[PDB]
Amino acid sequence: GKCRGLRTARKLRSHRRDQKWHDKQYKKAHLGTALKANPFGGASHAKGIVLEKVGVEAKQPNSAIRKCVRVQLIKNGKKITAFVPNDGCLNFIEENDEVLVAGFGRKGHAVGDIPGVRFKVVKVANVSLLALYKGKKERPR
Amino acid sequence: ADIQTERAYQKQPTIFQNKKRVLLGETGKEKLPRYYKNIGLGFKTPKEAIEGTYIDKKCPFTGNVSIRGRILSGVVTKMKMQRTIVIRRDYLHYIRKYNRFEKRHKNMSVHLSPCFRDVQIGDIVTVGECRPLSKTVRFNVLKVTKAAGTK
Amino acid sequence: ARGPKKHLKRVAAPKHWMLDKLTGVFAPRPSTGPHKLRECLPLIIFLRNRLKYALTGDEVKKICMQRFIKIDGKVRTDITYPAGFMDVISIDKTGENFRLIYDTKGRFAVHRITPEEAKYKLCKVRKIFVGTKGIPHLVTHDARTIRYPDPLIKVNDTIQIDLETGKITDFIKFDTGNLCMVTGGANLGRIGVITNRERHPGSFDVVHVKDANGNSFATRLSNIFVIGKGNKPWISLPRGKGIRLTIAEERDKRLAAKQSSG
RNA sequence: AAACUGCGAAUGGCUCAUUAAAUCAGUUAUGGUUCCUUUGGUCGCUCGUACUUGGAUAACUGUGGUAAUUCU
RNA sequence: ACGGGGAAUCAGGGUUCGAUUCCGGAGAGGGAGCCUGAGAAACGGCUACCACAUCCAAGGAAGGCAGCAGGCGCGCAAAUU
RNA sequence: UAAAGUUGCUGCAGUUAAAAAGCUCGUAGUUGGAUCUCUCUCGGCCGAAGCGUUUACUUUGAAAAAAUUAGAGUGUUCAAAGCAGGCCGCCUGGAUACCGCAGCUAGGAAUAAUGGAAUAGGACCGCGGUUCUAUUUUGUUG
RNA sequence: GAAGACGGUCGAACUUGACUAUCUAGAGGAAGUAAAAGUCGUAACAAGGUUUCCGUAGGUGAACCUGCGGAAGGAUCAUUA
């Protein structure tokens, strides 16, 4: 059982401090290895240069070729695989051009079918993918 | 005893001991009145301070120390320094989240005037705040209360 | 910081000035003078915010530089001159005299006094000391030094100063049973008879005071200003006689006054 | 106008790199210190050319140097 | 990691945040040393070194926007010379 | 941040879902059984009348920037706001509460700690006892 | 009363030999994870065809096998003077 004494505040506080490190979320947030290992470096978005276009096979229950791009982040130079969400949107991206990439929605975790992909392309050539998909804007020549 | 143990002469700066007195008018020693003051706040000057021969400029009673500020208490923990002791102040600090307390302590170095002869380890001392007397010392022992088990 | 500060932010100004928050970034930093920065009312606040004789600081300066404003019988042209407790402000052009006197809310009231009352002021003696080959000296809260005071005058007493000559004409001792105002703390601006003084050597003496309505409070001795011998003040008091109504009685009085009109 | 003299330029504004009982906050102390200014006091309290003393230097005039300066 | 007043959230309890207009501290590219002054180890003061950098007739001279605008760079990220 | 009683003080779990050390001793830490209902100034209504071992606790009282928060008043045209305003020169605001912890203060005395004499070095007190106060009651050490 | 010199002091910095972190157009080992939709077997789940598992030690192209001691989470809560 736990200590119930008027002068056990030190023991209770120290035990909570120690046992908080056994929480995955707390340790990830407060240890610093996750921020060092995070390609964005704690940022919500990041810019990169599209190194190439790749096709990732969906995980076994599903069958599809998810169109991603290998990009290299400008801020630090890391190589990232970023999903290109909608259909035909891979036709908007051209190799060796600027691209704004966000997280995939699960805070550094792969989403759905696409394995090992935790980033998605948000903008290409400083115009959003949603504007290109709907025809609101066009690629700058 | 041997008051003059330092390289410089030891004397109370306010007492003139070189007054001219004829030999035949001697009653006891020629002339050495002892300077002492009564510190405030109801504290009693120790008898050893009034009838002593020690020279201590940091003494609250016969020295050049004015007591003002906080009056604290502690238990004597160490007496391994010259005219200085280390006392321990124990207290309970409240942690609000757990609605509880924890034992904390602070060690305080206080000047011990030689007027308090026979001061042991573990007895209570009432100290008063003064000007900085050294790097770490800012309190002077004003009262000594013996420990409960001391016969 | 290096050296002294010269500005006062409007929000760091004393709250009893009743300055608003949108007029500017700065409040008029009181000049050095007889009264402390937080226990004074600058001349600009008095002539602009309280009396509405001026709309801006430029108009306050225009009034002051015509030498129309006297403080304690002397013309002052400094618009941030610190006027404090008991100080007499005379505007001879409009023929009006005021005495800076605290409200029961702790604010300096616009308290108009007769020209006969404007001839003198009460001063709480801050210290008594002997200097200059045995000459006794007295220092008041107003920071004026008086040589050769009465031998009976002690610290915490109240003297009466004739502003024309600036010498003591009367004095009240600090005794139990004497009327007093409170010049600081939670009870600032309250007037009552001193009941008892509990002494704490090496610390702050506490003085207990009883209102004219029977309410008892307590302050530090440094916040007590003896006003009159017995229960009779030696100065005029504001419309509220130092009796601090609770919020319920204030509400009731306001409602009664409102319902009496129309 | 200029220039000499006096005063301010140590305030304000910016930023958060440093900094882990350090800063800071509340609480006290300076009887262990300094304090321009403001305000009040003191300022024939000293037993020993005056109906006003001396030499400069700016500004100004004039001569200049350097590629170049709020140089001189 | 500037501290605090405080902010977000919150049944009770808490959790996180506080560079940011108020108060206190610190700094003025990095260190160091001073002059004047009541007050500065001041940088819209000086002296030197370190880094960067401006003009030059090559002898020398002059620097300090974490002030207000504004520019470059950085970046996901922030306005008028 | 809540949801997360998935960090649990309130308030979680540990047989088999993750989990009690192989087992004992043991210092610090934490927690510990009953018990105890004048006032050495006294003057013919007033004051030199005492934290009276102490602390923790509790209830006060001081003292504690403003802004923010809560909150009183106030038809910004409503509201976020603001600290204004209102009445035919006059009248009225610019409140108040809260402000952990530590420090100061004063009542209570349950609860909790602590103390009082057992080698009597014990409480009250009549009787004594070996240095020594610089005020002596009015022509000054005559 | 200037330049200047000596000696101190504060002391930036310089030369010199010694002690952290990351990008790699490089090597070089044994590892882990995912896709194994391929081979070699069959270790485990039924007494899984040698009951399984734990500690330890040794040996195997591999799951594994064997010795010693333990457990039932056993395939026996039981076996009779």
UniProtKB/Swiss-Prot annotation, chain A:
TM region positions: none
PANTHER family: 30S RIBOSOMAL PROTEIN S12 FAMILY MEMBER
GO cellular component, one term: cytosolic small ribosomal subunit
Protein name as it appears in the record: Small ribosomal subunit protein uS12
Record localization: Cytoplasm, Cytosol; Cytoplasm; Rough endoplasmic reticulum; Nucleus, Nucleolus
Biased composition annotated in UniProt, kind: Basic residues: 1-19
Species: Homo sapiens (Human)
Pathology linked to this chain's protein: Brachycephaly, trichomegaly, and developmental delay: An autosomal dominant developmental disorder characterized by brachycephaly, ciliary trichomegaly, dysmorphic features of the face and hands, hearing loss, and developmental delay with short stature. Intellectual disability and autism spectrum disorder may be present in some patients.
SUPFAM superfamilies, A to Z: Nucleic acid-binding proteins (SSF50249)
Known role: Component of the ribosome, a large ribonucleoprotein complex responsible for the synthesis of proteins in the cell. The small ribosomal subunit (SSU) binds messenger RNAs (mRNAs) and translates the encoded message by selecting cognate aminoacyl-transfer RNA (tRNA) molecules. The large subunit (LSU) contains the ribosomal catalytic site termed the peptidyl transferase center (PTC), which catalyzes the formation of peptide bonds, thereby polymerizing the amino acids delivered by tRNAs into a polypeptide chain.
Modifications after synthesis and translation: Hydroxylation at Pro-61 affects translation termination efficiency.
Family affiliation: Belongs to the universal ribosomal protein uS12 family.
Keywords associated with the record: Acetylation, Cytoplasm, Deafness, Disease variant, Dwarfism, Endoplasmic reticulum, Hydroxylation, Isopeptide bond, Nucleus, Ribonucleoprotein, Ribosomal protein, Ubl conjugation
Residues joined by cross-link Glycyl lysine isopeptide (Lys-Gly) (interchain with G-Cter in SUMO2): K36
Subunit-level organization: Component of the 40S small ribosomal subunit. Part of the small subunit (SSU) processome, composed of more than 70 proteins and the RNA chaperone small nucleolar RNA (snoRNA) U3.
One GO-annotated biological process of the protein: maintenance of translational fidelity
Residues covered by region (Disordered): 1-25
Ranges in coiled-coil conformation: none
Major location category of this protein: cytoplasm
Presence of keyword Endoplasmic reticulum: yes
Superkingdom of origin: Eukaryota
Curated annotation (Swiss-Prot), chain B:
A GO term from the CC aspect: cytosol
GO terms, biological process: cytoplasmic translation; ribosomal small subunit biogenesis; translation
SUPFAM superfamilies: Nucleic acid-binding proteins (SSF50249)
Post-translational modification Omega-N-methylarginine, affected residues: R68
Effect annotated for changing C59S: Abolishes S-acylation
Any matching Pfam family: Ribosomal_S17_N
GO molecular function terms attached to this record: RNA binding; rRNA binding; structural constituent of ribosome
Primary location: cytoplasm
Residue numbers bearing the Phosphoserine modification: S66, S109
Modification N6-acetyllysine, positions: K37, K44, K57
Posttranslational mods: Citrullinated by PADI4.
Modified residues (N-acetylalanine): A1
Localisation per UniProt entry: Cytoplasm; Nucleus, Nucleolus
Keywords: Acetylation, Citrullination, Cytoplasm, Lipoprotein, Methylation, Nucleus, Palmitate, Phosphoprotein, Ribonucleoprotein, Ribosomal protein, RNA-binding, rRNA-binding
Residue numbers carrying Citrulline: R21
S-palmitoyl cysteine lipid modification positions: C59
Protein family per UniProt: Belongs to the universal ribosomal protein uS17 family.
Subunit: Component of the small ribosomal subunit. Part of the small subunit (SSU) processome, composed of more than 70 proteins and the RNA chaperone small nucleolar RNA (snoRNA) U3.
Job description of the protein: Component of the small ribosomal subunit. The ribosome is a large ribonucleoprotein complex responsible for the synthesis of proteins in the cell. Part of the small subunit (SSU) processome, first precursor of the small eukaryotic ribosomal subunit. During the assembly of the SSU processome in the nucleolus, many ribosome biogenesis factors, an RNA chaperone and ribosomal proteins associate with the nascent pre-rRNA and work in concert to generate RNA folding, modifications, rearrangements and cleavage as well as targeted degradation of pre-ribosomal RNA by the RNA exosome.
Protein's recorded name: Small ribosomal subunit protein uS17
Species of provenance: Homo sapiens (Human)
Native organism taxonomy: Eukaryota, Metazoa, Chordata, Craniata, Vertebrata
From Swiss-Prot, chain C:
Keywords from the named record: Acetylation, Cytoplasm, Isopeptide bond, Nucleus, Ribonucleoprotein, Ribosomal protein, RNA-binding, rRNA-binding, Ubl conjugation
Glycyl lysine isopeptide (Lys-Gly) (interchain with G-Cter in SUMO2) crosslink residues: K229
Modified residues (N6-acetyllysine): K232
Any one biological process term the GO annotation gives: positive regulation of cell population proliferation
Pfam families: 40S_S4_C, KOW, Ribosomal_S4e, RS4NT
GO molecular function, one term: RNA binding
Superkingdom as given in the UniProt entry: Eukaryota
A GO cellular component annotation in the UniProt record: membrane
UniProt-recorded name of the protein: Small ribosomal subunit protein eS4, X isoform
Entry's family note: Belongs to the eukaryotic ribosomal protein eS4 family.
Location of this chain's protein in the cell: Cytoplasm; Nucleus, Nucleolus
Subunit structure comment from the entry: Component of the small ribosomal subunit. Part of the small subunit (SSU) processome, composed of more than 70 proteins and the RNA chaperone small nucleolar RNA (snoRNA) U3. Identified in a IGF2BP1-dependent mRNP granule complex containing untranslated mRNAs.
Organism name: Homo sapiens
Stretches that traverse the bilayer: none
PANTHER family given in the database record: 30S/40S RIBOSOMAL PROTEIN S4, SMALL RIBOSOMAL SUBUNIT PROTEIN ES4
Stated role: Component of the small ribosomal subunit. The ribosome is a large ribonucleoprotein complex responsible for the synthesis of proteins in the cell. Part of the small subunit (SSU) processome, first precursor of the small eukaryotic ribosomal subunit. During the assembly of the SSU processome in the nucleolus, many ribosome biogenesis factors, an RNA chaperone and ribosomal proteins associate with the nascent pre-rRNA and work in concert to generate RNA folding, modifications, rearrangements and cleavage as well as targeted degradation of pre-ribosomal RNA by the RNA exosome.
Primary localization: cytoplasm
Residues covered by the S4 RNA-binding domain: 41-103
